[PDB]
Design a protein around this ligand. Structure first.
Ligand SMILES: [K+]
Ligand SMILES: [K+]
Ligand SMILES: [Mg+2]
Ligand SMILES: [Mg+2]
Ligand SMILES: [Mg+2]
Ligand SMILES: [Mg+2]
Ligand SMILES: [Mg+2]
Ligand SMILES: [Mg+2]
Ligand SMILES: [Mg+2]
Ligand SMILES: [Mg+2]
Ligand SMILES: [Mg+2]
Ligand SMILES: [Mg+2]
Ligand SMILES: [Mg+2]
Ligand SMILES: [Mg+2]
Ligand SMILES: [Mg+2]
Ligand SMILES: [Mg+2]
Ligand SMILES: [Mg+2]
Ligand SMILES: [Mg+2]
Ligand SMILES: [Mg+2]
Ligand SMILES: [Mg+2]
Ligand SMILES: [Mg+2]
Ligand SMILES: [Mg+2]
Ligand SMILES: [Mg+2]
Ligand SMILES: [Mg+2]
Ligand SMILES: [Mg+2]
Ligand SMILES: [Mg+2]
Ligand SMILES: [Mg+2]
Ligand code: NA
Ligand code: NA
Ligand SMILES: [Zn+2]
Lengths: 99, 212, 44, 56, 101
RNA sequence: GGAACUUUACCAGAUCCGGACAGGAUGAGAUUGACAGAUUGAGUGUUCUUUCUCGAUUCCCUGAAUGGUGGUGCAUGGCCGCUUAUGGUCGGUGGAGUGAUUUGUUUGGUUGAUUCCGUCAACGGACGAGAUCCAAGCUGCCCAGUAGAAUUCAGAAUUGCCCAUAGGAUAGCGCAUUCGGUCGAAUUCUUCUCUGCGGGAUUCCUUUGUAAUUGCACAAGGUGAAAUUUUGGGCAACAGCAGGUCUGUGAUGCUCCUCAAUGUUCUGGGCGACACGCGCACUACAAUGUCAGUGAGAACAAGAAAAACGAUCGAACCUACUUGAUCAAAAGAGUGGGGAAACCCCGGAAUCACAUAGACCCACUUGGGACCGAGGAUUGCAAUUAUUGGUCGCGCAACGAGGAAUGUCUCGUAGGCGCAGCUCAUCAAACUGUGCCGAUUACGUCCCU
């Protein structure tokens, strides 16, 4: 099912902002695991792909595919969107952007 | 428990093939020319060879850090166990990958096949290559597809020594009419150090030393 | 592979529509008027 | 419901329907030797990178 | 105690360079050396049809992968052995350390 | 491409949205999911009755998008096959033609070779051929507690008069042999095994040979592990074919379908269906045999797992031994080992051998084992259209050497013989390799193609 729960969406978005990229295998029957700092949270792979499709169609991320694996990277528009969606403090950066 | 030697060697080779494909697609715009890695007990030290080094790095290494994150999550590398380096190609005219990518960009910018191909050949021979061959195929003129080949200099084709003296690369160009294939073959000169050449001379060349 | 103009025998099954119960939670609690003047509530 | 019925057979994970190429995701002519799990067509284009060399 | 070093690689030149480097460094320590044994070379063989569509003469491509293995036995403490194998190894060479009994 | 489901593209039906996003209409109740009852092939909320649950993720319709083993290989990329196993191919400058074009690249001898020598309006070049590369034979250094050997101690075994039921032929005539469980120690060593770089062969040596009458070479023999591309492979030019593949890919243009779908799942069926024709195999028609015994004996190779699941390992994989066994096979169990020169393994393969004093005796017969019956076990979620082994029946199935035609092949080859890998949960009459036993014929020709 592609009915993504809101808490699952926020956890994926929070992981996406912290580490600027998300890598997920292309399999409908699968699970994606993200560290999100402390603890570990798992989201179905089909639901992760559904969330990234919306961002891709909104020109908020860059998508790369190779060997059954997705590679999504937030661009400047996505980083600004992620900051506003999560209400992150201004001048908060992903680990890639961070010094 | 521990993987056998045959399984470990296969696992390393499959990892390199996937890493090669990922970097080939991600750094197509830059002059990606190859990748090497050296796994130690502490880190992995992946090294990326490119001509347009500054763009693969990005602003304060933003793009290279994004590449590190992609490789880290894909292969489940722990924190601090993976490091990425980028080094410029010493001679970009002797790299078939750099030239076939340059040819691909020129063709995609609506440039004449004859002008684009001879530009690659002229540049490659100006870099010291003994020979260069460029092939372009597909629907160039109309509905019917032709293959055009432009060559200059030396080129060996048979035997196995041509796999160390000739650098070859092929790419797909997606134009409006369909797909176009471009190939670049470069005959490398013999560098004594063996850096950008196979060091040893041609297998069928005999040189008589001048008496002192 | 082409459309063969399938002729169905059974009627077309409709799609499920979630029936809306206007203020459903209003009837999950009963308001009992207290002697003081307020009301009391309990789960039903 | 339908969620339990969805992809039930594929969840068993038995037969050629459960295996696929690690590159092309295709389920035809899979090379399972040494746990390569690569299609025979994809193997030819990636043999040199994996380490296999064509001699004799 | 006896420490065994196992050297395995796909490249014959790299596996010989690392093995000789370990032998030279161990000789400088004046430790007892059990000469580098050349284990049998194992070849991985994959034979596939050349065509991607099954048309024409059934021609085949034989792909081979060779694995080279060497072992050296050291009569030295693990501290001495550790600093013997502490140089810049060639890429593609795997050195494993085990303690015999 | 050895399809039970899956795969799967086909057929009969049922779900799912995996129609992003944008613009509008609903909306804190947008919506999601459901027990029971019946709908149904479904102890499938698919839908309904009836209720709760979830909650701004979604539903509604408009454009759009997406996926497709949908079309078109006569729109294409890439790859492969074939023209084409042979010796072929093209510039520059110069010569010759009004020009296409030609010369070079021709002719004689030689070579598998446009390989060489000579000649020569050509001269200089570039590819292919050759070389290179990988295996196989001889050999050097290196090397072993994942390979072996020889000696020395102790420990056990045979031990001399022996003549088979009829008992031949076949080495022996300072110290007699034997025991990988005797899992006994010790010492020494690299003949055998392992291999990263080397060595070694080249027409090198010899003919009152051939030829030369320069040369390039050739034929016999010698040397030698190997005597002519050493052997076997890999690679392999330039021009092409409307050859094959859109059923390998997130390789692709255009085009088609797109919410009761040609997308995608799930259930069942089919891809296996038989008056018949054809290609390629397997098994045979028996005595140079079939059975029942016994002996000695290869090589290439394969082997177990997650960011899961359990308490850094342990369980998947392959095996030995034991047990079942106080009574068939196939099984089923227990224990141990192996990441693979370490366990399997001293790899007891099958052709083969046996003076086995074994059975059969020329017959569709103890040849052949198609077809079918009954019990039982095993793989799997599922075995009916027998999945596959094993047991006993069936053998009274054709077949007694195959018309016209026709394939492949020159030495460790053909043919015969098994083994491993590959497909693989289960299933090789297939393929890819491997070793074993090992010939007849030719050493030519251009008659056929
Ligand atoms: K031709
Ligand atoms: K003829
Ligand atoms: Mg050749
Ligand atoms: Mg089958
Ligand atoms: Mg089905
Ligand atoms: Mg089926
Ligand atoms: Mg429903
Ligand atoms: Mg389909
Ligand atoms: Mg064609
Ligand atoms: Mg084509
Ligand atoms: Mg001229
Ligand atoms: Mg001319
Ligand atoms: Mg000519
Ligand atoms: Mg001749
Ligand atoms: Mg000639
Ligand atoms: Mg061609
Ligand atoms: Mg055609
Ligand atoms: Mg198409
Ligand atoms: Mg395809
Ligand atoms: Mg299409
Ligand atoms: Mg449908
Ligand atoms: Mg079929
Ligand atoms: Mg036919
Ligand atoms: Mg016999
Ligand atoms: Mg008979
Ligand atoms: Mg013929
Ligand atoms: Mg087959
Ligand atoms: Na060929
Ligand atoms: Na029987
Ligand atoms: Zn593939």
């Amino acid at each position: 099912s592609t009915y993504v729960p809101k808490p699952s969406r926020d956890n994926v978005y929070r992981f996406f902002f912290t580490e600027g990229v998300i890598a997920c295998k292309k399999d409908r029957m699968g699970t994606w695991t993200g560290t999100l700092g402390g603890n570990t949270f798992t989201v179905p792979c089909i639901q992760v792909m559904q969330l990234m499709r919306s961002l891709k169609s909104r020109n908020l991320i860059k998508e790369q595919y190779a060997w059954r694996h997705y590679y999504w990277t937030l661009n400047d528009e996505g980083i600004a969107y992620m900051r506003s969606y999560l209400h992150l403090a201004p001048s908060a950066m992903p680990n890639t952007q961070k010094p | 428990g521990p993987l056998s030697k045959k399984r470990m060697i296969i696992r390393d080779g499959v990892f390199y093939a996937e890493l090669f494909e990922f970097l080939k697609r991600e750094l197509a715009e830059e002059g990606f020319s190859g990748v090497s890695y050296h796994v130690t007990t502490l880190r992995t030290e992946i090294v990326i060879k490119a001509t347009k080094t500054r763009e693969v790095l990005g602003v304060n290494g933003r793009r290279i850090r994004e590449l590190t994150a992609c490789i880290q999550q894909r292969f489940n590398y722990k924190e601090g166990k993976l490091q990425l380096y980028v080094e410029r190609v010493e001679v970009r005219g002797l790299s078939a990958m750099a030239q076939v990518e340059s040819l691909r960009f020129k063709l995609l910018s609506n440039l004449q096949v004859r002008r684009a191909a001879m530009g690659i050949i002229r540049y490659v021979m100006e870099s010291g290559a003994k020979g260069c061959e460029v092939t372009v195929g597909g629907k160039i003129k109309g509905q019917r597809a032709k293959s055009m080949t432009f060559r200059d200099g030396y080129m060996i084709k048979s035997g196995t020594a041509h796999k160390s003296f000739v650098d070859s690369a092929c790419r797909h160009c997606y134009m409006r009419a369909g797909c176009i294939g471009v190939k670049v073959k470069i005959m490398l000169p013999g560098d004594s150090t063996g850096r950008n050449g196979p060091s040893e001379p041609l297998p069928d060349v005999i040189t008589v030393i001048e008496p002192k | 592979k082409k459309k063969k103009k399938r002729i169905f025998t059974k009627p077309k099954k409709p799609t499920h529509r979630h029936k809306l119960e206007k203020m459903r939670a209003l009837k999950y609690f009963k308001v009992t008027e207290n002697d003081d003047g307020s009301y009391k509530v309990e789960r039903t | 419901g339908h969620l339990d019925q969805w992809r039930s057979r594929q969840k068993i994970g038995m037969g050629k329907g459960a295996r696929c190429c690690v590159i092309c995701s295709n389920q035809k002519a899979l090379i399972r030797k040494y746990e390569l799990n690569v299609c025979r067509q994809c193997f030819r284009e990636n043999a040199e990178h994996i380490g296999f060399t064509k001699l004799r | 105690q006896t420490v065994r070093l196992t050297i395995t690689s796909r490249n014959a030149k790299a596996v010989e360079s690392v093995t000789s480097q370990l032998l030279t460094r161990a000789r400088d320590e004046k430790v007892t050396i059990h000469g580098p044994v050349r284990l049998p070379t194992r070849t991985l063989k994959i034979t596939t049809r050349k065509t991607p569509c099954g048309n024409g003469t059934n021609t085949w491509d034989t792909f081979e992968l060779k694995i080279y293995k060497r072992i050296i036995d050291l009569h030295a403490p693990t501290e001495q052995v550790k600093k013997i194998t502490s140089f810049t190894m060639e890429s593609g060479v795997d050195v494993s350390i085990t303690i015999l009994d």
